[PDB]
Amino acid sequence: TITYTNKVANARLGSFSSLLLCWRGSIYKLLYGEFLVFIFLYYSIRGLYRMVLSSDQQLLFEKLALYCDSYIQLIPISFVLGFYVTLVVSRWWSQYENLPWPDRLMIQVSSFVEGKDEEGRLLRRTLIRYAILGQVLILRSISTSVYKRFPTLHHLVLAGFMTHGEHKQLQKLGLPHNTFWVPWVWFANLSMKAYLGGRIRDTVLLQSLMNEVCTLRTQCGQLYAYDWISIPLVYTQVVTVAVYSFFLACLIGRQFLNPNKDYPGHEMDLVVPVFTILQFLFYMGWLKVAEQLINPFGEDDDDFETNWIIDRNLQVSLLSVDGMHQNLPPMERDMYWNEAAPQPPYTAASARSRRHSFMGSTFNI
């Protein structure tokens, strides 16, 4: 992704004007190849009309250009563009909201499952690995950058996400479906076996663990559904025959005709259509928002970095459930042990952020 939050913290004179000089993941990079084609077509038509066409055909071209001018309307195109990229943006955010994080699960696995020895460490590590395996399995079927990293299920065994026995057992199901639901069923059976044996104290804690697992299952299912069902092709094909039948009209009709005929609209010849290039930029960078956000798991500059979250999770979970169990800092008296109103100091550079407490909107009256 592209992060520019630190550059727009305050509304200064040039906060938004300085973002127009950005190259990576911007308008100038996304619509660089669609501008050359437009310019080449425009100048080819201009040259053909200026020298190739004869005097009699010049009048026909002039009348055709006059005709192809009442069809340049900006309301219908600005409506589809804008009712389309609100749905696209909402889908883009909801796709990120469903990314699984084992943060509410590693806490409970570290706490509830007891025992500080082997067969406790092994059990906790297996329990926390069975969820990262499911997350990797679902992400491999939707993310191109992750599929490139793990092109086959033997690569998972090589990378340590799997085990030889697990890989052998996963192949003995015989079902012609995606196998991203199997580790979630392994987790429940292993947790029940752990409970039968005195490692989990209570059925209350066991039910809490099951409830935590079901949410991750639901989130993975939602990601799979979003990938499977996309915005209908009839809706997608309407916005690109609304923005491609507008610059086509512009090409023949936004042409500097001969100024000897004294038209009410055309009386000056500029070489470059400065006010048409700006319209092209504004009306194409709006469509390239949808063209980029319609699948957030690609290899763009504004696509989710899924190869980093499956690396952070593997380290954080294994450190939380193995090396940080029953190991907490010493318990000591605080600084404000006998103070009823603690007053932490303010630094010199942040003395202007001091404020009084809000006490209701009717306090003054």
Contact in structure between 132 and 310 (CB atoms under 8 Å): yes
The site for Ca ion, by CB under 5 A, has a size of 4
Alpha carbon of residue 327 to chain centroid: 37
242 binds, among Cl ion, a second copy, Ca ion, none (CB under 5 to 8 A by kind): a second copy
Site stretch for Ca ion (CB under 5 A), options 52-60, 145-153, 277-285, 294-302: 294-302
Contacting Cl ion (CB under 5 A), which of 35, 101, 147, 195? Answer: 101
Contacting Ca ion (CB under 5 A), which of 285, 295, 309, 316? Answer: 295
User: φ and ψ at 121, to 5 degrees?
Assistant: -60, -45
Token pair recorded at residue 231? 């915005």
Q: Which is nearer to Ca ion, 58 or 295 (CB)?
A: 295
Comparing CA positions, the residue from 166, 108, 104 lying closest to residue 137 is 166
User: Tokens 């000897």 — which residue?
Assistant: 260
What part of residues 319-338 is at the interface with Cl ion (CB under 5 A)?
Answer: none
9 is in an annotated binding site: yes
Residues in the chain: 365
Could you give the C-alpha distances from 196 to 123, 132, 189, 190, 201, in angstroms and in order?
13, 24, 11, 10, 10
Contacting Ca ion (CB under 5 A), which of 115, 221, 273, 298? Answer: 298
Q: Is there binding between residue 115 and Cl ion (CB under 5 A)?
A: no
300 is in an annotated binding site: yes
269 is in an annotated binding site: no
User: Tokens 């610059």 — which residue?
Assistant: 247
48 binds, among a second copy, Ca ion, Cl ion, none (CB under 5 to 8 A by kind): none
What part of residues 208-227 is at the interface with Cl ion (CB under 5 A)?
Answer: 218, 221
Per-residue buried b or exposed e for 189-224, using 16+ beta carbons within 10 Å of the residue's own CB: eebeebbeeebbeeeebbeebeebbeebbebbeebb
Could you give the C-alpha distances from 360 to 339, 341, 355, 363, 365, in angstroms and in order?
27, 21, 15, 6, 10
Contact in structure between 274 and 13 (CB atoms under 8 Å): no
Q: Is there binding between residue 98 and Cl ion (CB under 5 A)?
A: no
Q: Is there binding between residue 275 and Cl ion (CB under 5 A)?
A: yes
What part of residues 154-213 is at the interface with Cl ion (CB under 5 A)?
Answer: none
What is the distance between the alpha carbons of residues 302 and 139, in angstroms, rounded to a whole number? 18
3 binds, among Ca ion, a second copy, Cl ion, none (CB under 5 to 8 A by kind): a second copy
Q: Give the footprint of Cl ion on this chain (CB under 5 A).
A: 101, 103-104, 218, 221, 273, 275-276
Enumerate the known binding-site residues for Ca(2+).
Answer: 9, 292, 295, 300, 303
Enumerate the known binding-site residues.
Answer: 9, 292, 295, 300, 303
Q: Give the footprint of Ca ion on this chain (CB under 5 A).
A: 295, 298, 300, 303
